[PDB]
Amino acid sequence: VAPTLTARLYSLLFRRTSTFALTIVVGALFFERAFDQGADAIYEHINEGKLWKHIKHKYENK
């Protein structure tokens, strides 16, 4: 007898107003790192070789 996934989520994070707000705070924090890293990767790939970070090595040498 194993309950569905949304069922476990309801009981574990959504039912209590405290726990439901915690989940959104923590969720947003994880979502933020993953989304920015992913989107930045997509943007840089679409523009591979054109951005300063891509050609920078050619002019530095601190």
Binding site: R16, T17, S18, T19, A21, L22, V25, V26, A28, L29, E32
Partner: peptide
């Protein structure tokens, strides 16, 4: 009563909010 446990998750939310958001 349920206020401690609810005040403690409200506690946590603010904290994680600030921490992250700020």
């Amino acid at each position: 009563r349920n206020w401690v446990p609810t005040a403690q998750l409200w506690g946590a939310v603010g904290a994680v909010g600030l921490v992250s958001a700020t």
